[PDB]
């Protein structure tokens, strides 16, 4: 499905205009609240003493119609940044009047043009309005992809258009937005209405605009090519851009006139529907993640918290993880038990953190298919998971499985395990203190024992996301340090973001750990080249793991396990956005620290511009041991 609207600058009547727009199939109409040509004075009489109504009444449409069917447009003659004091003051007064009227009508959104290098005064007026009343309305800035000064024809004899390869001259439009966004302190009520020109910029720019809060995309009717049948169509690059925007779920606003006069205007809209159909259907992972895209969640900590039944239920919905665990166990059993010893050799397998028993079932199936005898222990500390495991054992498993209701770090096993299978991998590799639990459990592993997962590594990648930063900033919890939300990680789907570099390994853990030194404190430094000249907002964290030899399981984008959806990338915010240039390699540093009672992460960026050390001494986020 696609939601689209119409853009008009003339509306002799509202009822018939809406009727025609609905007949054409649009969802909403973008109209001027005041007549665009009706200039108004506010200081110099007798102009300011203008009698009569200033605009059409609000009773023409019901409140429901105003709240959904109409989007206000700022008048074209309002230039708050003019060089003349009189014009500037009149523009300020007119903009305030129009914004107040839009609030009075309760318009869902208001379109403000943004087409100048300097628009500081407009930002001041808008932010002053945003702090007065209730103003539930949203604001969309109509910012062109390419500045008009760049796409004007070269038909002036003595005003030649620039031809130099201005690589940084093609991003100016974004700067216009970025600056305006900064002055309004990244207000959550300010979004972008990207305007697509006939000519598209370099791919890096269109990537730039990813991660910005784009709510609408404006398509002029002049960008549609004509097929041999006489209908409007889009170029291949335009089609790809439209597909990307659809994947971002923006609203499309068709603006202009019916250039293809031979066909009805609705045809334009119809074409978009056609493209909406050509969009490949979402995969299993995309369907699974639908709903929590760019939604912040605190990571789980099973070590001190106890998970609900629904948590285990959603864990068990993933078949890929357990199938790969079964494959790894089966391969390990085949390697360990030769055929000649099949009848006489019995392998001891311990499932740590068995939960509700899916790992136990996987181990039993692997042993059955490998035709190797095994004796299984299932260690679990959660008493309710223990209840479920005991019910399973009494009903199905029988004497083959022995359930232990104890923490593995404190339990004393009666036998040395040949294999220890565990799942304690959070979004970040060692987020859930898998290393500590596994090093505690190592004491009862055989000298030749095997630990699944065999090894796991974590990866970091810088990311820019205005939306993610705004949501993090909106996580202000009363009764707490005001800037604590930025010093704790979150697990997010990172649907709307820009990745500034390929992920690089951060920490590596391997079990069993035979090193005489047994320490988990770690310090890492990472260098990330940057080729986009954007603003850094945080670090996305993924992980990979080798369960046994070839059998691997990963969530890193380049080697993401197909279909697997059990984990979301973790997010490490940064207190302040950091601008970056074409050079300026980003140098970041990560610490994993512990004190025998808590575990926490400390991260800071040292280049290009330094930043405060986040979460020092677990000040704002710790995982209890």
């Amino acid at each position: 499905r696609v939601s689209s609207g119409r853009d008009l600058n003339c509306v002799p009547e509202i009822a018939d205009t809406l009727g025609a727009v609905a007949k054409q199939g649009f969802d909403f109409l973008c109209m001027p609240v005041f007549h665009p040509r009706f200039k108004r004075e506010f200081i110099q009489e007798p102009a300011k003493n203008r009698p009569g109504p200033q605009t059409r009444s609000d009773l023409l449409l019901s409140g429901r119609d105003w709240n959904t069917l109409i989007v206000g447009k700022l008048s074209p003659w309002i230039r708050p940044d003019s060089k003349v004091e009189k014009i500037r003051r009149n523009s300020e007064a007119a903009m305030l009047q129009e914004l107040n009227f839009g609030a009075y009508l309760g318009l869902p959104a208001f379109l403000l043009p943004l087409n100048q290098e300097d628009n500081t005064n407009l930002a001041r007026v808008l932010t002053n309005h945003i702090h007065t009343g209730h103003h539930s309305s949203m604001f969309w800035m109509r910012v062109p992809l390419v500045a008009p000064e760049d796409l004007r024809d070269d038909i002036i004899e003595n005003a030649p258009t620039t031809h130099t390869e201005e690589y940084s001259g093609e991003e100016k439009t974004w700067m216009w937005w970025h600056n305006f966004r900064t002055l309004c302190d990244y207000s959550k009520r300010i979004a972008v209405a990207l305007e697509i020109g006939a000519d598209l910029p370099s791919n890096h720019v269109i990537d730039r605009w990813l991660g910005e809060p784009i709510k609408a995309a404006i398509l002029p009717t002049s960008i549609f090519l004509t097929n041999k049948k006489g209908f409007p169509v889009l170029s291949k690059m335009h089609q790809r851009l439209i597909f990307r925007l659809l994947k971002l779920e923006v609203q499309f606003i068709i603006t202009g006139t019916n250039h293809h006069s031979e066909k009805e205007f609705c045809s334009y809209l119809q074409y978009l529907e056609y493209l909406s159909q050509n969009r490949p259907p979402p995969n299993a992972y995309e369907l699974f993640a639908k709903g929590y895209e760019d939604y912040l969640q605190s990571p789980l900590q099973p070590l001190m918290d106890n998970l609900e039944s629904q948590t285990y239920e959603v864990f068990e919905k993933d078949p890929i993880k357990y199938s790969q665990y079964q494959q790894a166990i089966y391969k390990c059993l085949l390697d360990r038990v030769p055929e000649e010893e099949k009848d006489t050799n019995v392998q001891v397998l311990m499932v740590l953190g068995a939960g509700r028993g899916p790992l136990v079932n996987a181990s039993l199936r692997a042993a059955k298919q490998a035709d190797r005898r095994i004796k299984l222990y299932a260690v679990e500390k959660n008493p309710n998971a223990v209840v479920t495991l005991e019910n399973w054992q009494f009903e199905e498993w029988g004497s083959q499985v022995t359930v232990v209701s104890s923490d593995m770090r404190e339990w004393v096993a009666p036998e040395k395990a040949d294999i220890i299978v565990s799942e304690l991998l959070g979004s970040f590799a060692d987020n859930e203190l898998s290393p500590e639990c596994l090093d505690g459990a190592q004491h009862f592993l055989k000298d030749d024992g095997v630990s699944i997962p065999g090894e796991y590594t974590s990866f970091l990648a810088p990311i820019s996301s205005s939306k993610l930063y705004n949501e993090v900033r909106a996580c202000r919890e009363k009764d707490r340090d005001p800037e604590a939300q930025f010093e704790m990680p979150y697990v997010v789907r990172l649907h709307n973001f820009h990745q500034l570099s390929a992920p690089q390994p951060c920490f590596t853990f391997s079990h069993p750990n035979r090193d005489p030194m047994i320490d988990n404190n770690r310090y890492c430094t990472l260098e990330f080249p940057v080729e986009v000249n954007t603003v850094l907002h945080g670090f996305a964290g993924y992980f990979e793991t080798v369960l046994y030899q070839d059998i691997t399981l990963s969530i890193r984008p380049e080697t993401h396990s197909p279909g697997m959806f059990s984990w979301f990338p973790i997010l490490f915010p940064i207190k302040q956005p950091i601008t970056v240039r074409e050079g300026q390699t980003i140098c970041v540093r990560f610490w994993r620290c512990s004190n025998s009672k808590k575990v926490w992460y400390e991260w800071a960026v040292t280049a290009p511009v330094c930043s405060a050390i986040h979460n020092p001494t677990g000040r704002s986020y710790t995982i209890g041991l």
Binding site: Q297, V491, S566
Partner: peptide, 6 residues
């Protein structure tokens, strides 16, 4: 919180 979060 479906995924790996609260």
């Amino acid at each position: 919180g479906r995924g790996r979060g609260r």
